[PDB]
Design a protein around this nucleic acid. Structure first.
Ligand SMILES: [Mg+2]
Ligand SMILES: [Mg+2]
Ligand SMILES: [Mg+2]
Ligand SMILES: [Mg+2]
Ligand SMILES: [Mg+2]
Ligand SMILES: [Mg+2]
Ligand SMILES: [Mg+2]
Ligand SMILES: [Mg+2]
Ligand SMILES: [Mg+2]
Ligand SMILES: [Mg+2]
Ligand SMILES: [Mg+2]
Lengths: 155, 206, 117, 60
RNA sequence: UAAGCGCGCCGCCUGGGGAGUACGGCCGCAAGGCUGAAACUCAAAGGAAUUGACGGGGGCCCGCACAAGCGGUGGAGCAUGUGGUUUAAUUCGAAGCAACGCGAAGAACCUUACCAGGCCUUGACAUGCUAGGGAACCCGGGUGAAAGCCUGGGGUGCCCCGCGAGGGGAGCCCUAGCACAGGUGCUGCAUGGCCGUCGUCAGCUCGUGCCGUGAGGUGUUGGGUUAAGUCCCGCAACGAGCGCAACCCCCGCCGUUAGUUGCCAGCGGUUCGGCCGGGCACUCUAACGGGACUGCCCGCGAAAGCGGGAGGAAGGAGGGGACGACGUCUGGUCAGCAUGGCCCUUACGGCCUGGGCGACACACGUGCUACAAUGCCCACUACAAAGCGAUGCCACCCGGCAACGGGGAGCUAAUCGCAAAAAGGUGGGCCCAGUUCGGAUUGGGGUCUGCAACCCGACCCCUGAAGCCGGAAUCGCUAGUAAUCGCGGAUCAGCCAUGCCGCG
């Protein structure tokens, strides 16, 4: 807001892997404060990453997140009559946030019926450079670039 | 629509109840009703006496009423005939036996209700309001108030356009909760309807 | 004061600061409880608000004014430099000397020259 | 219909149901609290004067 | 380089409009120029400066204002308020924000202000005067839907003439007469009181001084800083007041007091639930206190303050309340109340029975339940807080599939009860389907409240609508917040509460 930069909330680390990044993601899976369900959904899903590969879920998790972060996004800026979608950098923080949200949002578009499978497969696909999360992210750099002409308003 | 009742705002702190009894759910209803027919009767009969309060205590289901007047002379009578009937009137209207004590309001010019009543009485008798007001405030301050405010509502001098002539001196820190701002409110009934009068007397702190 | 024993912390902060600026601005001006009988100003243009006030109360104005100033609004002028510390001290000191002598009890020249530049 | 309705409220009639709360100063029939016997206006007006014993502005 | 001080000479003005127009005359190729009125009309037109307000002006600065987000409304059913239509009546008010789950914290009769019809008039209510009777009170008889009208009885305590005849008598009640009552009939621009709102925004003023012919200005323009006219610095100002803040309550840490109905750490006993001894330590309860102040450290800064650090349960206003300046809005309310004025008087007053405020071709606001798998059902198992209750909360039996009904303890309630908390957890069932999603609508059979549930109550038990996430648009929220899950209360016989205020 207007006065100051606003403090970013330090999340409490994860109770299993001890990663702050896992509770973020869990907090995105969470709906109506039903956090038990959420973390219960994320851990089942980590076990699905075992059954379908001898890889640690954390490693693969961290790899999905890295492939869904965007580099640049169109951010809407206004002239005063007509409006230009302008391309520009993405913050570290914003990247993480975008990445986890898409991941979740993407995972729940999926056609399998349990959430834990949906989140696992979508994690698997995204670390393999191509889920629906990755399209979103791609779409977003293909929205910049499609508009690289207007990169001289970089606000 | 604003400013809350400077008495209601104090109550626990700074300023005390005008009725202090206890009653449970089954009882409050009826004692409160009495209180009210009590205050109501004394409110009109002891008009000439200039009454500021009508405090009401109640113990072994027996009722003591302190009437804080400026003119005990008037409530009493010559040798106390008037206060006789007054003690009997209350008893008539309450099925009970009621102590009725008088208490001189030491300085009536620090009694917000009285100051207010006086200005109201002045108005009812076609006195100039602005002056009446301003004087009331001089009287209060002369009598050692730390501050005083007086407000006459509207239809001053009989106008079609209702108004609101205020006037004040010293501090009247209404937001300050340790203050001890007596407050008072009388009507002026007139040929031309009602004007309300508010007096605030500020007396000291802690 | 044994009243300072008590008193909120907020009163301490507020009252100390208050005194402090009182102390600051009113140190000289407290010793007189009456309109003076004359004022003595160094730069009367620099200090023209003060000259204006005296002029208005029929108080005599004495000043050490230099070429910058309007002598017509000074009753007793010391026409001379009013910017050199050296020049003022000369004239402030001899002027005060004159005062004491004339009040009874001639004296020594006081501290002035603290470190003259 | 008011003065005679504050009156018909006191008489208690055929059928116990027909009786109703009705404020004790205001004749008001609505928003009368059974503890005080008072309308919600009446109760505020008195509360502020310190004429409802015990009753205080609440704040938590 | 006068708009100063003066002399010379020229030109021009004499309220605004009519109008630089008309007429005339002169000039011009023409366009038009110059010269230039009046009627009539207005009570001004106008200069400059002042305080505001305003800007599709500027600078600086704020708020869930946007932005970033998360969840909704707008679509569907239904609940509810409103427009409108309708009606005998669908009483009345509220109208952008700030009217529309608002007055209403409880419309079947009551409420109730409306409609119909049946009834009453000194009246349902008050103060008082005159008079034959009656003089408290209480009971049935007709006629009625009920009011009411008509009726017939039981039967005078009291002051007192008194040992009584008999006779004075005050309460009190009916009959008629007189004053008077009654009016939710009108006016919220006649009002008071109370409320909304701009806005918890950071403002609004004053006394003296000083500036200005004056309105007025300074103070309160500036620089910094703050949540803040908060503070600092500066300054023809120095102060002060209403506001801000603080003083008040709740929540967070700890202490002292207190130890039952509350607690149970170590004992001892034990029909297990602290049940008995013990004990108040801890938890609580609730009353009084302590505790935070940029106080300390580092850095920046002239200062105020800021960034960071340490300690501390807690910092930089710790988190929430209460609290609303001078004023604004011809804001809201004569239907809470009060009130000036206006109006009604076998009626615009009053009583009743019934209807209506619940009407439905539509439109809108606020909500609820949803469309499902992060879900739904069933079983089992947990963990709250704040409230409420002795014509009331109801344990526990029993009967009933059940609502509920029979019994029937305990509880003037830190004792007993409402009480099951739900979401959660554990089992199991569903397997993507208009479905074991969703529960509208409709049929039946029951229960309960109440004189009475047809219009019109809730609840229980055996059809299964729309709806596959909602257009333009639009709302809420910055943290224990939103989101989600239940719990309690006021009103209240019952309840149309999915509302409200609270609690976790
Ligand atoms: Mg009722
Ligand atoms: Mg011509
Ligand atoms: Mg937004
Ligand atoms: Mg809808
Ligand atoms: Mg009306
Ligand atoms: Mg108004
Ligand atoms: Mg209106
Ligand atoms: Mg109006
Ligand atoms: Mg209605
Ligand atoms: Mg369909
Ligand atoms: Mg489906």
């Amino acid at each position: 807001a207007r006065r100051r930069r606003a403090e970013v909330r330090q999340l409490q680390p994860d109770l299993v892997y001890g990663d702050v990044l896992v509770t973020a993601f869990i907090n995105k899976i969470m709906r109506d404060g039903k956090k038990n369900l959420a973390a219960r959904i994320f851990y089942d899903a980590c076990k699905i990453i075992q059954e379908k590969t001898g890889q640690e879920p954390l490693k693969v998790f961290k790899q999905a997140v890295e492939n869904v972060k965007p580099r640049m996004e169109v951010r809407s800026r206004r002239v005063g009559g007509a409006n230009y979608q302008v391309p520009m950098e993405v913050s570290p923080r914003r990247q993480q946030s975008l990445a986890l949200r898409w991941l979740v949002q993407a995972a729940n578009q999926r056609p399998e019926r349990r959430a834990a499978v949906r989140i696992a497969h979508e994690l698997m696909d995204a670390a393999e450079g191509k889920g629906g999360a990755v399209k979103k992210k791609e779409d977003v750099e293909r929205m910049a670039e499609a508009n690289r002409a207007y990169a001289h308003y970089r606000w | 629509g604003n400013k809350i009742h400077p008495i209601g705002f104090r109550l626990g702190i700074t300023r005390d109840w005008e009725s202090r009894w206890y009653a449970g759910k089954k009882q409050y209803r009826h004692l409160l009703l009495e209180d009210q027919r009590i205050r109501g009767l004394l409110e009109k009969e002891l008009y000439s006496a200039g009454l500021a309060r009508v405090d009401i205590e109640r113990a072994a289901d027996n009722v003591a009423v302190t009437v804080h007047v400026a003119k005990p002379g008037v409530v009493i009578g010559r040798g106390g005939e008037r206060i006789r009937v007054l003690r009997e009137e209350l008893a008539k209207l309450t099925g009970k036996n009621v102590a009725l004590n008088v208490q001189e309001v030491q300085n009536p010019n620090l009694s917000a209700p009285l100051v207010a009543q006086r200005v109201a009485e002045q108005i009812e008798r076609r006195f100039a309001v602005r002056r009446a007001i301003k004087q009331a405030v001089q009287r209060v301050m002369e009598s050692g108030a730390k501050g005083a405010k007086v407000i006459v509502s509207g239809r001053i001098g009989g106008a079609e356009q209702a108004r609101t002539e205020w006037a004040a001196q010293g501090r009247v820190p209404l937001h300050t909760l340790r203050a001890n701002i007596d407050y008072g409110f009388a009507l002026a009934r007139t040929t031309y309807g009602v004007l309300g009068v508010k007096a605030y007397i500020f007396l000291g702190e802690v | 004061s044994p009243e300072i024993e008590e008193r909120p912390k907020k009163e301490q902060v507020r009252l100390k600061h208050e005194l402090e600026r009182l102390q600051k601005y009113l140190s000289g001006f407290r010793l007189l409880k009456r309109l003076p009988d004359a004022i003595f100003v160094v730069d009367p243009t620099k200090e023209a608000i003060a000259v204006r006030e005296a002029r208005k109360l029929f108080i005599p104005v004495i000043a050490l004014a230099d070429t910058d100033s309007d002598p017509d609004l000074v009753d007793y002028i010391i026409p001379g430099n009013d910017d050199a510390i050296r020049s003022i001290q000369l004239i402030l000191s001899r002027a005060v000397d004159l005062i004491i002598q004339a009040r009874g009890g001639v004296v020594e020249p006081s501290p002035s020259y603290a470190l003259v530049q | 219909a008011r003065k005679a309705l504050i009156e018909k409220a006191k008489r208690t009639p055929k059928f116990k149901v027909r009786a109703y709360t009705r404020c004790v100063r205001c004749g008001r029939a609505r928003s009368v609290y059974r503890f005080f016997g008072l309308c919600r206006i009446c109760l505020r007006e008195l509360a502020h004067k310190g004429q409802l014993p015990g009753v205080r502005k609440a704040s938590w």
